[PDB]
């Protein structure tokens, strides 16, 4: 609420987020 939530967390989603991206990539990430 001070855009501490946007700063560090940010650097981990961009590390995380970018091979998470992939996994977005097309689909297929559930039905059993």
């Not at 961009?14 to 990539?25: I, K």
Request: net charge positive; glycine share 18%; no cysteine.
């Amino acid at each position: 609420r001070r855009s501490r939530k946007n700063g560090i967390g940010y650097a981990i989603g961009y590390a995380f987020g970018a091979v998470e991206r992939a996994v977005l990539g097309g689909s297929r990430d559930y039905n059993k």
